[PDB]
Design a protein around this ligand. Sequence first.
Ligand SMILES: *[C@@H]1O[C@H](CO)[C@@H](O[C@@H]2O[C@H](CO)[C@@H](O[C@@H]3O[C@H](CO[C@H]4O[C@H](CO)[C@@H](O)[C@H](O)[C@@H]4O)[C@@H](O)[C@H](O[C@H]4O[C@H](CO)[C@@H](O)[C@H](O)[C@@H]4O)[C@@H]3O)[C@H](O)[C@H]2NC(C)=O)[C@H](O)[C@H]1NC(C)=O
Ligand SMILES: *[C@@H]1O[C@H](CO)[C@@H](O[C@@H]2O[C@H](CO)[C@@H](O[C@@H]3O[C@H](CO[C@H]4O[C@H](CO)[C@@H](O)[C@H](O)[C@@H]4O)[C@@H](O)[C@H](O)[C@@H]3O)[C@H](O)[C@H]2NC(C)=O)[C@H](O)[C@H]1NC(C)=O
Ligand SMILES: *[C@@H]1O[C@H](CO)[C@@H](O)[C@H](O)[C@H]1NC(C)=O
Lengths: 536, 541
Amino acid sequence: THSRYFEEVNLDSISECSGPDMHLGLGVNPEFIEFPSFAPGSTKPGSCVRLPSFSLSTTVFAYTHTIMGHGCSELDVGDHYFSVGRIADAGHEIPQFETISSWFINDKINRRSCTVAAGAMEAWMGCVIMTETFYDDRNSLDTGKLTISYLDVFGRKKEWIYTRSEILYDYTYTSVYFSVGSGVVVGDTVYFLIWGSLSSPIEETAYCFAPDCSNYNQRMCNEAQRPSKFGHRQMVNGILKFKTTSTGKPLLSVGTLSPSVVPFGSEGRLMYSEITKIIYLYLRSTSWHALPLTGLFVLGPPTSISWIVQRAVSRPGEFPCGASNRCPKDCVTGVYTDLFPLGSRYEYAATVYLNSETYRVNPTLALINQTNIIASKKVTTESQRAGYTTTTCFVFKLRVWCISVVELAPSTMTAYEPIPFLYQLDLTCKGKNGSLAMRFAGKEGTYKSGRYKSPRNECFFEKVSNKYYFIVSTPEGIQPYEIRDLPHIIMYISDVCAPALSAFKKLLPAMRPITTLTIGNWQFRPVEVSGGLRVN
Amino acid sequence: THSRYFEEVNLDSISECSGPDMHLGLGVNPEFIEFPSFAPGSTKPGSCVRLPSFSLSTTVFAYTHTIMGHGCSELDVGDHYFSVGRIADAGHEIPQFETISSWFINDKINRRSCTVAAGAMEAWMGCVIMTETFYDDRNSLDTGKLTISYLDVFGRKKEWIYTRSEILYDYTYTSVYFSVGSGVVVGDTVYFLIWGSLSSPIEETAYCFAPDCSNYNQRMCNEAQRPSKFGHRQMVNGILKFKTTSTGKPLLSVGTLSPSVVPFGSEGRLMYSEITKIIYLYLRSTSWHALPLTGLFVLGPPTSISWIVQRAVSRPGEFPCGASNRCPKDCVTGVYTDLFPLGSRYEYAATVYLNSETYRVNPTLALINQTNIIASKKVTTESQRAGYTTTTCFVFKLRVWCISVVELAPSTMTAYEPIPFLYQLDLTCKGKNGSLAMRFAGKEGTYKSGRYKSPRNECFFEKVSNKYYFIVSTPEGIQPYEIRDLTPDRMPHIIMYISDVCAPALSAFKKLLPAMRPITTLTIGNWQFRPVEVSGGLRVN
Ligand SMILES: *[C@@H]1O[C@H](CO)[C@@H](O[C@@H]2O[C@H](CO)[C@@H](O[C@@H]3O[C@H](CO[C@H]4O[C@H](CO)[C@@H](O)[C@H](O)[C@@H]4O)[C@@H](O)[C@H](O[C@H]4O[C@H](CO)[C@@H](O)[C@H](O)[C@@H]4O)[C@@H]3O)[C@H](O)[C@H]2NC(C)=O)[C@H](O)[C@H]1NC(C)=O
Ligand SMILES: *[C@@H]1O[C@H](CO)[C@@H](O[C@@H]2O[C@H](CO)[C@@H](O[C@@H]3O[C@H](CO[C@H]4O[C@H](CO)[C@@H](O)[C@H](O)[C@@H]4O)[C@@H](O)[C@H](O)[C@@H]3O)[C@H](O)[C@H]2NC(C)=O)[C@H](O)[C@H]1NC(C)=O
Ligand SMILES: *[C@@H]1O[C@H](CO)[C@@H](O)[C@H](O)[C@H]1NC(C)=O
């Protein structure tokens, strides 16, 4: 079909090379590649782009970010960006993200916690509206007023505004928020992940599975489930289901997950694999279980969740509920850092987590294997401030790629700005023999190993200010030299890059203050020259 | 539908109320509107987006920005963003910019000074390539390697690479660079503005006009033409012309402007108006003429330029040639800040200039005549660093709008980032009576006066953390208030709506100065509102 990717393949999560004989790792360190960002920046000073939501299906992908105006305030939340696009081939091994349709919402009504679900050549956006024109001092739970938007690759834009009565709730909620993590569409049913407080308790038996707590009790568990904030109402998680084959306004149903399996109802992401027929469930830890809440969710009655222990990363938060905290405590704090599953049962994962323990700073890309971190790479710097992070991986031209959008603070004129990063995960599983024990394969074929292209290590001549200069271009740095000696003899680049590269790779920390000349009359001196129009 | 904007028309012509009885100004203060930026940001921490080029024709607009990689270095210049799009109507008075086709160049060859020119349903891009695999210590003319890219609204892409011999040069150049300011397409001919050093001097006296200089000499004028940095080669300006509808590779011709009219050859912008049939020419001042170099180019078989004196803004520069030197000195420095003409003969102009004297900081939007500044507004802060600025104005639904893309520094992860700003210029011409003596008109009708919509002055109830509270949203600030029952209806439980308390609360909120609303209890009717700052527990800010 048109307006759809082709070389895009879901990860073969059967890539579980377990057993002590085989060890999984990365062959080539991931490198951030430059491409036109599908997340357009803000143009009004003060208005910040935040809360990114990215979903990838087997046909198209969808993206959404909220533009909080009036100095990055959560009270002017009516301006959003909703886009549907597709990955594409541009004649190279680099997947090129393409935006085909975009729906820039600019109405006045405040829509918060806008999540996205990429479907079959279409996308659904779930937001909620808490603003109300009337007020009653008596107890009067306002309609959740959630809006479901519908954007197709053909430019079609539709939307429905629901009330509390139209939606089928199994239990009465006090407030309903969409999890900023992406929804998922399977078959004819779109499922979104929601979280909210219930008016009355249900099981009163919290998750109460302490990861590494020495002293804990059940009362602490069920007390943390109903924090002091939100009015001591149990924060539970639920699934919103509505069918795409419905005429006009879709019918909505809500199935609330039992509080015994969900530790704390908060934001989270739903991912589904056609290769596995499994819906992996990520749940952001906004309470005490700072260790990542990954699990495998089972559709259809009876709905079942299998939580998986992750002890390689964590989410920063305020004391006493920051990283390294393992005991149940009444607290609401944390950050959204999802973990994309790279195994059939979350055996291996790829994520962009905040390395700090308390302050939400230092974004770091990392591949984990539940026990440790297989590999790691800092996004920018250690002092970099960050916010929500989302990560989604795919396969393009028999190579595993990943796109990770992270909120970064500050910005050029705003407080936050979600920026995407495309990188290659050269997954390699090798034995004790030091050799690759197995080559990961898929339906399209065996995944290729190595870099998509050889590193650029060239040397050329460049004219600046009517003067020619030798240029050594290496992946670690580019240095210009000035030719300073001789119509009797002419020359070209010939083979001077490699002899210069050999000495330039060793004296790289010294920035090569000397230059080994040639036997001929030619010679060059290392000087830094710049254009006259931009001194910078 | 079609792939062009509707209800968009050019300005000028009617803006001729230059009579001393009538003064021209702005009615409503310009406000930056939020829209999805058609300048996509960078995704690599090392590569920085820079050198924006924006062109707007009578059908579509074109944009281009260069991604300098390897730590924002001007040596890794192979990535470029080329886009063609259109304005559109979304049921509002706001001009919504729409990007139709985008061509992300990612070759390895270094292309510097990439200029764009919009026209009909397509756009042309002119870049140069100074990289050469060959080299000669003796003086040899390098291949021009001019690359002309071609992008249509249907996604069609084409490109040509030229040679020093294929192009028709009236004089032998040593180096040729495209002016970052946008080109223009008239009829079937695409005109770009180029600048460069000549191998041999034409030996013509410079512009040699004195912007209020007590002492200047003829030789001082000729010194700036041939600076020491470029090897005493006269920096001249020329026009590259190539015709569309040509077979295969289009033929390129170069017409060098005489050094008598052009003071110093550097970057510049060409803008042509269908209503006026004139090509207004901006020239970036990179020498001593710190005053903005605006002029009116005519396409006559004899090339002719008439420069218009502007004494309202200037460009920051080094100590010998700053924004206040204005007298002939041998120097090469400055910044690109073009001025979009709002008059038939550059009578009024709109720009975003750097208000500082030396450092390229403090970007400031300003509308000027030929002597002073009509109105001014800083973009963000005074300490904001900036770079190149480009500005293009138009009409949408009988309203004067302007888009200004300026380089801002620093960025989120790069050194530079071009960001656009959309604002409305409420041009009003009136006399001392104080009543509007002139209503600006156009082909579609009289340009409407006033703000595009009434300012948002709303009040509403919002529930956060299961707690309802008042929210007063005004254009100056948004304040939440805790609702409390001041014995209303002789019962604690009550029902109140927005329209019953919003208008007087808005009146009281506008009177209270900043830092007073978040501490002042607002009591009205039978309800007490207490300014309390509360946010959701998900994200603390
Ligand atoms: C999750 O992923 C992490 C990634 O670090 C794994 O943690 C490491 O696991 C390894 C075992 O797989 C631990 O032991 C290390 O083994 C190396 C040798 O491994 C085999 O391979 C070589 C050939 O490739 C053979 O020569 C050798 O006999 C082994 O059969 C050693 O190299 C490591 O330590 C030494 O390395 C060099 C010398 O090569 C020395 O200079 C170093 O100083 C060092 O002494 C090491 O012994 C390793 O310790 C684990 N690291 C951590 C941080 O825990 C997890 O196992 C994995 N979890 C899973 C899969 O469940
Ligand atoms: C080129 O642009 C300049 C800026 O637009 C023009 O300057 C303006 O010229 C008019 C001519 O009438 C002056 O109008 C008079 O101004 C005074 C004062 O008005 C207010 O402004 C001053 C600012 O210093 C302030 O001190 C006062 O308190 C007032 O608030 C009135 O008394 C008169 O009635 C009359 O309107 C403008 O003042 C003047 N503006 C500035 C900033 O100098 C200039 O005329 C243009 N040139 C041409 C040839 O058109
Ligand atoms: C302003 O007032 C005068 C009073 O004589 C009047 O004649 C004129 O028409 C009015 N309007 C103008 C000058 O635009």
